[PDB]
Design a protein around this ligand. Structure first.
Ligand SMILES: Nc1ncnc2c1ncn2[C@@H]1O[C@H](CSCC[C@H](N)C(=O)O)[C@@H](O)[C@H]1O
Ligand SMILES: Nc1ncnc2c1ncn2[C@@H]1O[C@H](CSCC[C@H](N)C(=O)O)[C@@H](O)[C@H]1O
Lengths: 229, 230
């Protein structure tokens, strides 16, 4: 079965690869800008991993109030060390994206709630979007970008997928993790269903889901919504 | 929780009341004329109820190709019998306004797609408008007129609401359903959001939401758009 967290040497390796390849976060940062991210806002990043996005965002936007959340304590610890390494004061938090638990003080407070390359791992996708919309304030936006199931790739997209898999500088284990993460990723319609389910509970004034590739290097699923005011 | 369909004897009763109050549709019929309705067009009515609009429209515009759709089979049942009773030839279908399922043959075919006093009942309002824009031809129009949430009534508007309820010739059980329908209605801004959303997915050349009362007897929300040309 699919595994949710990334732990131990897997996580150190995820952090080594990631923080050298900053370029590949640019797609996500650009969506945030399009989503209305701005100085002084409160931004919650669910499944924050080793903190790369947090370092990028604080560097670009020193004004932001950032809270990273991850289910893997090791990731939380790596992130804090990485923050210290970069001389930054960032809040990291142990937590499950599938529930508000441990984040009750953030309920209705985030200007933006976001997750990068993580929600495909969730056991209950609708619960992830539920947590996002409950954390975000009325009028605020949520953004998820995560992996698409292998069955929704067309021929050119799949060629690009295999080519991407080959061209990366990762080992046997980390190749398999990333491929397996697509084996178990939700389909496009699964994303649309999950977000629709979450919006039945917390109304949105806008929603949108699509698949493209604007820089990461394979197609990923974009899910955007704005909580109704 | 809010309910979508109107069923059984409540639908028989709905029909009994509507049957003898054609005048209450004049406001809606007048808006269709403003929307560009014309003889020989194909017109889909979503959430058609017991078919009163279809009887009125076929009488006023005899060669319109009218398709009524409703989630209540009993409403469909009623509508069909009522059309036969009136000696008219009219297609009624079972279906959900929140999706094109069962209406794929109408996709992109309607010159007008309309719904009267029903969209406030939908669980997913944006999907209602999506089905509307998808059923209409490029260059065609959509019109929804439906109920306003109680929170968007100003004082005079609300006084009217109470007075309308009082002086309607109908029983306790009917009043409550009509009141509850407003209790659960979208706010004005919810209508604006749901239509913009539907228009993000199917482009419009024109749209407009407003609130007034030109005949029905309370303020209702009007939603109009024209699908962009191909
Ligand atoms: N249910 C859950 N709640 C919170 N974090 C979770 C989670 N399931 C998996 N994760 C975390 O999701 C992350 C996937 S890797 C993505 C890390 C980071 N968002 C980035 O883009 O670089 C891991 O850190 C993993 O521990
Ligand atoms: N999701 C849905 N899809 C189709 N019809 C629906 C629906 N939700 C409610 N309805 C129908 O909406 C109608 C509301 S009563 C309005 C009837 C008619 N339009 C008229 O103006 O007289 C009922 O017949 C009910 O069954």
């Amino acid at each position: 079965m699919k595994i949710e967290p990334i732990t131990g040497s897997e996580a150190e390796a995820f952090h080594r690869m990631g923080s050298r390849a900053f370029e590949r976060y640019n797609e996500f940062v650009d969506l945030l800008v399009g989503a209305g991210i701005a100085d002084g806002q409160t931004v919650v990043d669910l499944c924050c991993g080793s903190g790369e996005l947090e370092i990028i965002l604080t560097s670009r936007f020193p004004s932001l109030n950032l809270v990273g959340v991850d289910l893997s304590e090791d990731m939380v610890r790596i992130a804090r060390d990485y923050a210290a390494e970069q001389g930054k004061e960032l809040e990291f938090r142990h937590g499950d994206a599938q529930s508000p638990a441990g984040m009750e003080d953030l309920l209705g407070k985030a200007d933006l709630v976001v997750s990068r390359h993580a929600f495909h791992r969730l056991t209950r996708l609708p619960a992830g979007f539920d947590t996002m919309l409950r954390l975000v304030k009325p009028g605020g936006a949520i953004l998820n970008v995560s992996f698409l199931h292998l069955s929704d790739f067309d021929e050119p997209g799949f060629r690009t997928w295999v080519r991407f898999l080959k061209e990366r500088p990762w080992d046997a284990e980390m190749q398999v993790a990333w491929a397996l993460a697509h084996y178990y990723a939700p389909r496009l319609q699964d994303y649309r269903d999950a977000l629709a389910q979450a919006a039945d509970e917390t109304p949105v004034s806008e929603q949108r889901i699509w698949v493209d590739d604007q820089g990461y290097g394979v197609a990923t699923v974009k899910c955007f919504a704005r909580r109704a005011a």
